[PDB]
């Protein structure tokens, strides 16, 4: 049950995710998972990033879920659960702006 996860913000808008993530106290990789506003059955992994060029900013990645079971951002790298996906991306940046580090405070 992803709804039991503390990083699962459920039905919140993209703008709301950005308001929460754009807090100066948030280090790179602060994140949350929410429902996509318009992509049915897909979730959105919203992540904070920071650099001298752009300063504090937010990226959104789409998490696809197959009825076949797996969860993924890229079909080449799938997981048996959303929790396993979050755990993988907390260790690897791969194509993301930063590895997942801290659950976004409300
Ligand atoms: C109109 C085309 C359209 C396609 C996808 C999105 N996705 C969302 O905004 P999300 O970032 O909550 O997933 C928005 C517009």
From Swiss-Prot:
Organism, scientific name: Homo sapiens
Family membership noted in the UniProt record: Belongs to the protein kinase superfamily. Tyr protein kinase family. SRC subfamily.
Quaternary structure and partners: Part of a complex comprised of PTPRA, BCAR1, BCAR3 (via SH2 domain) and SRC; the formation of the complex is dependent on integrin mediated-tyrosine phosphorylation of PTPRA. Interacts with DDEF1/ASAP1; via the SH3 domain. Interacts with CCPG1. Identified in a complex containing FGFR4, NCAM1, CDH2, PLCG1, FRS2, SRC, SHC1, GAP43 and CTTN. Interacts with ERBB2, STAT1 and PNN. Interacts with DDR1, DDR2 and DAB2. Interacts with CDCP1, TGFB1I1 and TOM1L2. Interacts with the cytoplasmic domain of MUC1, phosphorylates it and increases binding of MUC1 with beta-catenin.
Task performed by this protein: Non-receptor protein tyrosine kinase which is activated following engagement of many different classes of cellular receptors including immune response receptors, integrins and other adhesion receptors, receptor protein tyrosine kinases, G protein-coupled receptors as well as cytokine receptors. Participates in signaling pathways that control a diverse spectrum of biological activities including gene transcription, immune response, cell adhesion, cell cycle progression, apoptosis, migration, and transformation.
Gene name in the database record: SRC
Record-annotated SH2 domain positions: 7-104
Annotated localization: Cell membrane; Mitochondrion inner membrane; Nucleus; Cytoplasm, Cytoskeleton
Disease: SRC kinase activity has been shown to be increased in several tumor tissues and tumor cell lines such as colon carcinoma cells. Thrombocytopenia 6: A form of thrombocytopenia, a hematologic disorder defined by a decrease in the number of platelets in circulating blood, resulting in the potential for increased bleeding and decreased ability for clotting. THC6 is an autosomal dominant form. Affected individuals may also have bone abnormalities and an increased risk for myelofibrosis.
Protein name: Proto-oncogene tyrosine-protein kinase Src
The record's account of how the chain is modified after translation: The phosphorylated form is termed pp60c-src.
Extra information: May be involved in blister formation in Pemphigus vulgaris, phosphorylated-SRC is abundant at blister sites but not in normally adherent tissue, which corresponds with loss and disruption of CDH1 in cells adjacent to blisters. Phosphorylated SRC is increasingly abundant at pre-lesional sites of blister formation and occurs prior to changes in abundance of CDH1 and DSG3.
Phosphotyrosine modification, residue list: 43
Free-text note regarding domains: The SH2 and SH3 domains are important for the intramolecular and intermolecular interactions that regulate catalytic activity, localization, and substrate recruitment.
Free-text tissue specificity from the UniProt record: Expressed ubiquitously. Expressed in the skin (at protein level). Platelets, neurons and osteoclasts express 5-fold to 200-fold higher levels than most other tissues.
Organism lineage: Eukaryota, Metazoa, Chordata, Craniata, Vertebrata
Source organism superkingdom: Eukaryota
């Amino acid at each position: 049950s992803i709804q039991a996860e503390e990083w699962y913000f459920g039905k919140i808008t993209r703008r709301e995710s950005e308001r929460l993530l754009l807090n100066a106290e948030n280090p790179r990789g602060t994140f949350l998972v929410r429902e996509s506003e318009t992509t049915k059955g897909a979730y959105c992994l919203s992540v904070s990033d920071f650099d001298n060029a752009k300063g504090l900013n937010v990226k959104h990645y789409k998490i696809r879920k197959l009825d076949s079971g797996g969860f993924y951002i890229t079909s080449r790298t799938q997981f048996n659960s959303l929790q396993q996906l979050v755990a993988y991306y907390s260790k690897h940046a791969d194509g993301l702006c930063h590895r997942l580090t801290t659950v976004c405070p409300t």
